[PDB]
C-alpha positions as MATLAB code, in Angstrom:
seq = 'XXXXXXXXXXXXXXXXXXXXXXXXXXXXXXXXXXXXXXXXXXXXXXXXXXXXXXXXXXXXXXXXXXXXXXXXXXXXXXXXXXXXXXXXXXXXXXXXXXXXXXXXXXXXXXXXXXXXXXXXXXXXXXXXXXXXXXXXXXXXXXXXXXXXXXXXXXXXXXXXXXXXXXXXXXXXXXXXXXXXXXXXXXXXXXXXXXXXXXXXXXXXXXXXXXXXXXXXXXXXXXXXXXXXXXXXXXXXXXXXXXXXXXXXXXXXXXXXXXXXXXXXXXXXXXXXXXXXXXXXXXXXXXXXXXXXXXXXXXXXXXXXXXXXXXXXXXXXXXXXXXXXXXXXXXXXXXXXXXXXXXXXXXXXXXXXXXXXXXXXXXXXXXXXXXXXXXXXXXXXXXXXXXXXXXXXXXXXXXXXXXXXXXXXXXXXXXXXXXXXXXXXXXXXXXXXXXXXXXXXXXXXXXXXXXXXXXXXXXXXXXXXX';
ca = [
      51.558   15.302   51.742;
      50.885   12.520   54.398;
      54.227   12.796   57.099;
      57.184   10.467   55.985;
      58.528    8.948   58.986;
      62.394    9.300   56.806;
      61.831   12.941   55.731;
      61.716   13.902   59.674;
      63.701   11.222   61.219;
      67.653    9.734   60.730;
      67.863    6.427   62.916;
      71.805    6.653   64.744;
      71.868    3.531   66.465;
      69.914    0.544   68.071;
      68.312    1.232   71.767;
      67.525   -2.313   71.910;
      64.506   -5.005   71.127;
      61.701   -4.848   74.026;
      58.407   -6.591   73.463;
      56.198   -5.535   69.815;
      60.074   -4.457   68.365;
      62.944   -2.642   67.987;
      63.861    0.897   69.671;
      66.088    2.621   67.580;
      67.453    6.349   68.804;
      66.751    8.629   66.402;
      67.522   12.364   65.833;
      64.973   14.980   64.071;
      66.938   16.055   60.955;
      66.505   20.009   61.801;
      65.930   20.641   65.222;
      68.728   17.971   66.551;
      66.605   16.257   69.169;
      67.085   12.613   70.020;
      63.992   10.690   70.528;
      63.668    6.549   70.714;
      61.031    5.206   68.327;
      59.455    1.631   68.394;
      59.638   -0.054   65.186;
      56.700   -2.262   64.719;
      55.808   -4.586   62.265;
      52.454   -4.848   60.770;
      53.238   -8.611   59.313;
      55.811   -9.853   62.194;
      53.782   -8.225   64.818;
      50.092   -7.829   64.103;
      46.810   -6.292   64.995;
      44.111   -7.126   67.476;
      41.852   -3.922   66.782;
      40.898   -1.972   63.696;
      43.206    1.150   62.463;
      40.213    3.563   63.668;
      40.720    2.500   67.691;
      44.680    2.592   67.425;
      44.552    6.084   65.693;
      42.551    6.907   68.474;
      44.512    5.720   71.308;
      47.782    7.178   69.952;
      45.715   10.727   69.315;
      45.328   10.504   73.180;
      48.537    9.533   74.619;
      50.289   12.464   72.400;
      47.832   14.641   74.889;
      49.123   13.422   78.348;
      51.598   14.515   80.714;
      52.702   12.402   83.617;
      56.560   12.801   84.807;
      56.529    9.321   85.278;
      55.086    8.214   82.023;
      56.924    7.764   78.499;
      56.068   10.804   76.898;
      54.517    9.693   72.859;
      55.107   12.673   70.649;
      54.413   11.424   67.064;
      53.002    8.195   65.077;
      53.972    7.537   61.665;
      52.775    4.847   59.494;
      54.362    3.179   56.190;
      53.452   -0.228   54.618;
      55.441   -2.593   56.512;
      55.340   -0.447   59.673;
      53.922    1.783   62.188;
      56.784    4.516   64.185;
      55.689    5.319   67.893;
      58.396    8.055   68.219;
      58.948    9.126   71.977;
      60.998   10.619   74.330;
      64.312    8.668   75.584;
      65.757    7.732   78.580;
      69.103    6.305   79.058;
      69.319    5.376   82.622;
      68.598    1.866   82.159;
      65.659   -0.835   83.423;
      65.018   -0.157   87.010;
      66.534   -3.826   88.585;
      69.708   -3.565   86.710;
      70.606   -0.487   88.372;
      69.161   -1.926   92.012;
      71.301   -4.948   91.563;
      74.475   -2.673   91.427;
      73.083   -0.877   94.816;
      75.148   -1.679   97.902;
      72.568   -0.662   99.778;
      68.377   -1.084   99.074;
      65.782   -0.194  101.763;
      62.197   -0.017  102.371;
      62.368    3.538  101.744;
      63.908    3.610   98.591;
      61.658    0.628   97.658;
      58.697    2.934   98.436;
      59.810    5.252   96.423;
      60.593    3.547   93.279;
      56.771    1.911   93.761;
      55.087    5.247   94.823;
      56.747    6.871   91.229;
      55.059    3.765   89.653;
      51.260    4.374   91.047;
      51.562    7.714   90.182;
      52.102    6.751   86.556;
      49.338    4.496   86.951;
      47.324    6.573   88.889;
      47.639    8.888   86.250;
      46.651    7.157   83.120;
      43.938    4.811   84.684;
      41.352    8.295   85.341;
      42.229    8.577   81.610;
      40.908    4.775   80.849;
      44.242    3.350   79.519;
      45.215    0.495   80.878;
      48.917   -1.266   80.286;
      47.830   -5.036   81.204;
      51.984   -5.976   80.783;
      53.415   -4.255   83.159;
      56.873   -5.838   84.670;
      60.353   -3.928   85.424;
      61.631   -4.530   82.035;
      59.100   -1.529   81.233;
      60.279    0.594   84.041;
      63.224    2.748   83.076;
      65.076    5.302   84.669;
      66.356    8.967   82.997;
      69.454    8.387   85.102;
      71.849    5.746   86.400;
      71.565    7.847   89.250;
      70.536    6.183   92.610;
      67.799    9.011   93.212;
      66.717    8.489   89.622;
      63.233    9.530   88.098;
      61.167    6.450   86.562;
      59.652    6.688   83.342;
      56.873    3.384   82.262;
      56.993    2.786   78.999;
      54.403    0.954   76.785;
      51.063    2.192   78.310;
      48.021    1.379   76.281;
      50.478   -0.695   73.569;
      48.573   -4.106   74.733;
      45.537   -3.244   73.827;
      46.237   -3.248   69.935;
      49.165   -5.170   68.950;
      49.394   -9.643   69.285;
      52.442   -9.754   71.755;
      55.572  -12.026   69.707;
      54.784  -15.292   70.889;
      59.037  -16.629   70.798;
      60.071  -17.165   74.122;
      63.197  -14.380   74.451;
      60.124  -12.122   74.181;
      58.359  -13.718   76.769;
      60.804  -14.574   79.580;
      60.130  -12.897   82.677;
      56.389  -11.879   81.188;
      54.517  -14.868   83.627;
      55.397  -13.513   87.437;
      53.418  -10.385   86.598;
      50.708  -11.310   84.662;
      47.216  -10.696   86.520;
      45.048  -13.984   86.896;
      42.288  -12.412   85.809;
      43.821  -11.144   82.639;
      45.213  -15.330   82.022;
      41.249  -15.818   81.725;
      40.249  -13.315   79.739;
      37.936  -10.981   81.854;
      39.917   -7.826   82.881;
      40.042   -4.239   83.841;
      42.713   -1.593   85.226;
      42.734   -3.474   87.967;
      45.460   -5.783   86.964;
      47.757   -2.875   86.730;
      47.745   -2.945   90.375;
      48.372   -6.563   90.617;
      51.599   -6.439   88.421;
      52.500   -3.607   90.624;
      51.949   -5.867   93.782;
      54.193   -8.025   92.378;
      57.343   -5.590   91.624;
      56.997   -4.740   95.140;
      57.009   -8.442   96.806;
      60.338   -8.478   94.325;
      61.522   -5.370   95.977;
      61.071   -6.125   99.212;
      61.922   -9.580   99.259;
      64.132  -10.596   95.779;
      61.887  -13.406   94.901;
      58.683  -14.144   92.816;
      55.336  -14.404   95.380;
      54.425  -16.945   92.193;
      57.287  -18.587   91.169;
      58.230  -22.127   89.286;
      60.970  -24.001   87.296;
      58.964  -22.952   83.710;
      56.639  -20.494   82.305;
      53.213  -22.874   82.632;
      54.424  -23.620   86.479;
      54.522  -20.182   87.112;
      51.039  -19.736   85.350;
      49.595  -22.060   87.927;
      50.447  -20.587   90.395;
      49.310  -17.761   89.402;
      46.050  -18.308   88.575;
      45.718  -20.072   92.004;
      46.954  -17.046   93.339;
      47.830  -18.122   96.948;
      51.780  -17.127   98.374;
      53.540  -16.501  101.289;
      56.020  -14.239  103.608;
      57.153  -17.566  104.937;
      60.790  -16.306  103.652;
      63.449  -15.686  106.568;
      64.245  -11.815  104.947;
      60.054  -11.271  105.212;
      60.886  -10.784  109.207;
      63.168   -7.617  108.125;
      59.795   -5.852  106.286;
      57.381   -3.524  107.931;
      53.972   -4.807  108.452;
      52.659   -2.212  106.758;
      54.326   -2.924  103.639;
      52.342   -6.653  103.935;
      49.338   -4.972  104.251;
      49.615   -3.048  101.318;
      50.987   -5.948   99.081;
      48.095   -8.234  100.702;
      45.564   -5.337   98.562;
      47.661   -5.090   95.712;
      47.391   -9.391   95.520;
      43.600   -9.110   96.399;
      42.563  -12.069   94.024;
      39.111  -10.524   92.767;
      39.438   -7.561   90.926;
      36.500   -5.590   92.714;
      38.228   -6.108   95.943;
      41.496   -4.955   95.040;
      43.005   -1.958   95.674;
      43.041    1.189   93.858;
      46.145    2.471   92.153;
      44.775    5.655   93.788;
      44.036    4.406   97.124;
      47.476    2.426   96.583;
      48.986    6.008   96.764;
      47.254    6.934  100.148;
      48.257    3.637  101.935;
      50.124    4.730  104.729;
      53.335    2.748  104.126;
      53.406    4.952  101.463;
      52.662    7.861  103.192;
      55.083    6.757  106.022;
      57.621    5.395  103.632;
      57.739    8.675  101.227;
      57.954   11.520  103.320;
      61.123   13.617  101.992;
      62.620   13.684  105.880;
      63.024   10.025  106.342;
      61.468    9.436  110.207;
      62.000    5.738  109.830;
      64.488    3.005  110.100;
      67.023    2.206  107.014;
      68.328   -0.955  107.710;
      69.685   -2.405  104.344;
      67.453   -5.683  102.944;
      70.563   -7.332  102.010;
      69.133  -11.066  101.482;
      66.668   -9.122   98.967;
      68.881   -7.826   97.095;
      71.115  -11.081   96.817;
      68.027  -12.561   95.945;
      67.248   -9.761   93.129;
      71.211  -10.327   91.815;
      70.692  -13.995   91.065;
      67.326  -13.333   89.908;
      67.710  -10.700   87.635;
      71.521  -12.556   86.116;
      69.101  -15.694   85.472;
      67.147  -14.157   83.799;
      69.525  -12.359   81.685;
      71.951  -15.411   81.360;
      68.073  -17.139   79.527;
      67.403  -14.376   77.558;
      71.099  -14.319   76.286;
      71.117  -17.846   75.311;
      68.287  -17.721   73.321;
      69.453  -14.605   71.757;
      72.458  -16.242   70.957;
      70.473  -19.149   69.599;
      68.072  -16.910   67.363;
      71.540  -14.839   66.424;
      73.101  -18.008   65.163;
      69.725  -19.222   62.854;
      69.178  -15.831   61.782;
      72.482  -15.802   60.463;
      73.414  -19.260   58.938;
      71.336  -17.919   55.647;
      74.183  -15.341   55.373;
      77.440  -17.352   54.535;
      75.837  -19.259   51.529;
      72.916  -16.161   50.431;
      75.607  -13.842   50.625;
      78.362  -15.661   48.513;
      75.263  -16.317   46.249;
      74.630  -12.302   45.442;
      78.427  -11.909   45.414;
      78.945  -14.912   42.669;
      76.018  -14.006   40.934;
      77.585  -10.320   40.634;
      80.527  -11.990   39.750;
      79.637  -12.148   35.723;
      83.222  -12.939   34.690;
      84.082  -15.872   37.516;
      87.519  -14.681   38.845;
      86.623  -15.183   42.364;
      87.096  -11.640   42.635;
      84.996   -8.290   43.178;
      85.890   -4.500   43.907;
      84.577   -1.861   47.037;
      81.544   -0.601   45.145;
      80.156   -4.513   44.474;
      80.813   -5.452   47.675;
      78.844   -2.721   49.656;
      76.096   -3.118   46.953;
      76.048   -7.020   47.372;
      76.145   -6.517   51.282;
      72.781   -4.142   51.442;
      71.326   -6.269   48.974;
      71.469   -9.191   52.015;
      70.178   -6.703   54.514;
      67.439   -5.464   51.473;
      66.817   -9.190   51.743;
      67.191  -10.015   55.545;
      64.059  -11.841   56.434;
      61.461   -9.305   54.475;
      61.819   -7.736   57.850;
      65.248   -6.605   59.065;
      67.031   -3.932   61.510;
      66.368   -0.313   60.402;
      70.098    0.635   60.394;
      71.413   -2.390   58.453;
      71.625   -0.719   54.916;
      73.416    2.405   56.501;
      75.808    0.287   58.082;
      77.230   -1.351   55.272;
      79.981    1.366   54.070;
      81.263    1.626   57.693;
      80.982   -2.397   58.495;
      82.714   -3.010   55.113;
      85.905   -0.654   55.335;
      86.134   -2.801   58.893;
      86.612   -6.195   56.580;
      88.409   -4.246   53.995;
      91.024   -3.022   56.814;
      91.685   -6.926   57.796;
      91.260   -8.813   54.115;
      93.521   -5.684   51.863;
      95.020   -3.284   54.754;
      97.359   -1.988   52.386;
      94.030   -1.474   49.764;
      94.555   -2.731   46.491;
      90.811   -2.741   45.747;
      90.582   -6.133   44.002;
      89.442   -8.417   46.339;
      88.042  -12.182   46.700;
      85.165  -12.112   48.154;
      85.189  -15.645   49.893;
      88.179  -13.912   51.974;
      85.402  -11.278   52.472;
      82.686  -13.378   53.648;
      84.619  -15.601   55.592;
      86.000  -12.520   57.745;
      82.609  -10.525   57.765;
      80.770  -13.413   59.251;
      83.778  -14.216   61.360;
      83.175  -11.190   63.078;
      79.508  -11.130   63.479;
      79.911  -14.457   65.217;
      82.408  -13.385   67.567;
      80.555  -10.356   68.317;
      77.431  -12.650   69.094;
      79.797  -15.103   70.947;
      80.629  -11.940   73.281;
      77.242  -10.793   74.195;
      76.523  -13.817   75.598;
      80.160  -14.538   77.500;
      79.185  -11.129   79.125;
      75.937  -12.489   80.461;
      77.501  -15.589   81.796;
      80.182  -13.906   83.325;
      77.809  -11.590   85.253;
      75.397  -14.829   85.932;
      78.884  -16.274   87.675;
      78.769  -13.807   90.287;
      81.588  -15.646   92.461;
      83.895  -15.819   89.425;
      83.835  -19.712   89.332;
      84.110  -19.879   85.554;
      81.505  -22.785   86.276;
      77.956  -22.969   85.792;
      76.719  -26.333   87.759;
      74.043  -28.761   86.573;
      70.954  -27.416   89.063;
      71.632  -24.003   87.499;
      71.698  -25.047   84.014;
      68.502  -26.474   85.270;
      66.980  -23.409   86.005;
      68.282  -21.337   83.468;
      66.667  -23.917   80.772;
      63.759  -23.902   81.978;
      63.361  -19.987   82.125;
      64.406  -20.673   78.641;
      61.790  -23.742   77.860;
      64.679  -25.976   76.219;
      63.404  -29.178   77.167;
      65.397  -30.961   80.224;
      65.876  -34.299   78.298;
      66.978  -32.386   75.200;
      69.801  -30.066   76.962;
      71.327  -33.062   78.834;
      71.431  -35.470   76.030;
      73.118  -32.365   74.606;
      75.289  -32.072   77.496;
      76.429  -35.852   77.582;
      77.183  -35.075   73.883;
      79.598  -32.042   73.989;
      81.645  -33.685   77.190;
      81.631  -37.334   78.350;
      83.312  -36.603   81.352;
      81.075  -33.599   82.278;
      80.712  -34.105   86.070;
      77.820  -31.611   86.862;
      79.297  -28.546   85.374;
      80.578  -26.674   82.562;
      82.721  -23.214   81.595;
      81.374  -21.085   79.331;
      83.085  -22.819   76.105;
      80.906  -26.097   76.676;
      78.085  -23.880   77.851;
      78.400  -21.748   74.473;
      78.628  -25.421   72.603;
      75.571  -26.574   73.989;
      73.551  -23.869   72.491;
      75.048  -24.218   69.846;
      73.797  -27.730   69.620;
      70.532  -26.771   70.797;
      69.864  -25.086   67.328;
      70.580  -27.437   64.729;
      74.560  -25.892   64.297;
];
């Protein structure tokens, strides 16, 4: 009698993959409504407590109310997984909707943090801490300007090893707490991630920033930084103050998320009838543009990179099933084999695969059918088949990433030049000697650039294909 996470729950389509898994939207099978659910893998992702303290935890959350918390509403387990089903927002991660602002001032920064240390606020008098917080885990319910910001992942850190790749871990070291790096820590360090969204917001730039993740680390765990920037004259000294307690380095003389609230740039800052000056901080958010499209462009490539791995097993596995299904050796196979030798690779993809894969199989296979048979004969060869149903999951993976680059090439160059492929590898740890022997390798006559074709090559490279 034990609650099947399938007899309550159909899984539509993919959210996306933030850090422990996949979030899948999914719709309650009688009562219609759409909630996103974390997929987590016991294996993949594993355990630092005992079941006992997670059941607890997750009995707790379900109890909590906090408009600008992710509400939790159910836990399911199974043998490869756990479910944390909760409510969903659609409104996007906080900095890709700032980044499309004309406009961005202190005010609305204040707002944005004040919504966060309320949610903090909030859950620290209940003792749950997040210890990753970072705007990848803010989200809004609207693409709205005025929009109301949910934090998702509270209390998650606690019991689950975060995925030690590095597309899971770009963008994690600006926000980490030093304290936290060395092993001693407390709710405090919420407050210090939160310090460092705001220097972000009011400035567009990292207070602890660095061409890789360990440079970053260090100085971090120095903690010393600056409002040497020029756009720093533009920002209330009130809002220093504030950040200046929020970046306290010793935990017992930080701030308070609570007292954070009560700081009167908040209270100035946040009053409904704005009393103060807007003027726009347009350096910051030039600076949050390129910072945010770097690290997109980083997170794309090694996407792309994992995508094209992940996938080389396909072409061969697949014509393996299919041949091995083929008992009479014609070269040839019908619908019904084809779908049943195309869940089989998904039954098969990694032990651990995508949710939706062996639903999407009829739907993804009528697609090939429609290019390899459009007038639908029904016996078909089934290299045809693989060679046009991985033809199309390579272009699709190919586009994900053009998209990226395109948006990282905010002045429409088509161009990407050396210094920034500089950067953007080392957000992505691809060793510098390694890219640019790759580099000399795809195009000779590279003179300190390349378009997205010799970009896309590179990575290519950069993985073995």
């Amino acid at each position: 009698s034990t609650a099947i996470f399938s007899d309550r729950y159909k899984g539509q389509r993919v959210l996306g993959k933030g850090s422990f898994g996949e979030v899948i939207l999914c719709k309650d099978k009688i009562t219609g409504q759409e909630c996103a659910v974390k997929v987590i893998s016991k294996r993949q992702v594993k355990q630092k407590t005992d079941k006992e303290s997670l059941l607890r935890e997750v009995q707790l959350l379900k109890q909590l109310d906090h408009p600008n918390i992710m509400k939790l509403y159910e836990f399911f387990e199974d043998k490869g997984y756990y479910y944390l089903v909760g409510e969903v927002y659609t409104g996007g991660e906080l900095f890709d909707e700032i980044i499309s602002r004309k406009r961005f001032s202190e005010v609305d920064a204040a707002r944005i943090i004040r919504q966060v240390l309320s949610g903090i606020t909030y859950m620290h008098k209940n003792k749950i801490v997040h210890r990753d917080l970072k705007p990848e885990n803010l989200l809004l319910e609207s693409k709205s300007k005025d929009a109301n910001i949910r934090i998702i992942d509270f209390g998650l850190s606690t019991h689950f090893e975060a995925s030690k790749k590095m597309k899971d871990k770009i963008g994690t070291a600006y926000y980490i707490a030093p304290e936290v790096l060395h092993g001693t820590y407390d709710e405090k360090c919420d407050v210090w991630s939160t310090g460092v969204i705001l220097y972000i917001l009011l400035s567009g730039c990292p207070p602890f920033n660095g061409a890789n993740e360990y440079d970053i680390l260090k100085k971090v765990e120095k903690g010393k930084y600056t409002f040497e920037l020029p756009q720093w004259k533009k920002v209330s000294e009130s809002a220093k103050d504030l950040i200046r307690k929020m970046l306290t380095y010793v935990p017992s003389m930080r701030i308070s998320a609570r007292d954070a609230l009560d700081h009167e740039w908040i209270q100035t800052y946040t009053k409904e009838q704005i009393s103060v000056d807007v003027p726009s901080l347009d350096n910051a958010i030039l600076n949050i543009r390129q910072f945010q499209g770097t690290q997109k462009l980083a997170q794309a490539a090694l996407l792309y990179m994992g995508s094209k791995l992940t996938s080389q097993d396909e072409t061969k596995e697949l014509t393996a099933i299919f041949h091995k299904m083929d008992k009479n050796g014609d070269g040839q196979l019908d619908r019904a084999e084809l779908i049943e030798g195309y869940k089989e690779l998904m039954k098969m993809k990694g032990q651990d695969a995508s949710m939706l894969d062996a639903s999407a199989v009829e739907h993804e296979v009528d697609q090939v059918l429609d290019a390899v048979d459009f007038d639908k004969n029904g016996y078909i060869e089934y290299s045809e088949f693989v060679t046009v149903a991985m033809d199309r999951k390579t272009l699709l993976s190919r586009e994900r990433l053009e998209r990226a680059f395109r948006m990282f090439d905010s002045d429409n160059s088509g161009k990407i030049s050396s210094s920034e492929l500089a950067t953007i590898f080392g957000v992505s740890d691809v060793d510098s000697e390694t890219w640019k022997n790759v580099l000399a390798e795809v195009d000779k006559n590279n003179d300190g650039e390349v378009d997205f074709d010799e970009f896309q090559q590179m990575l290519l490279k950069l993985c073995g294909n």
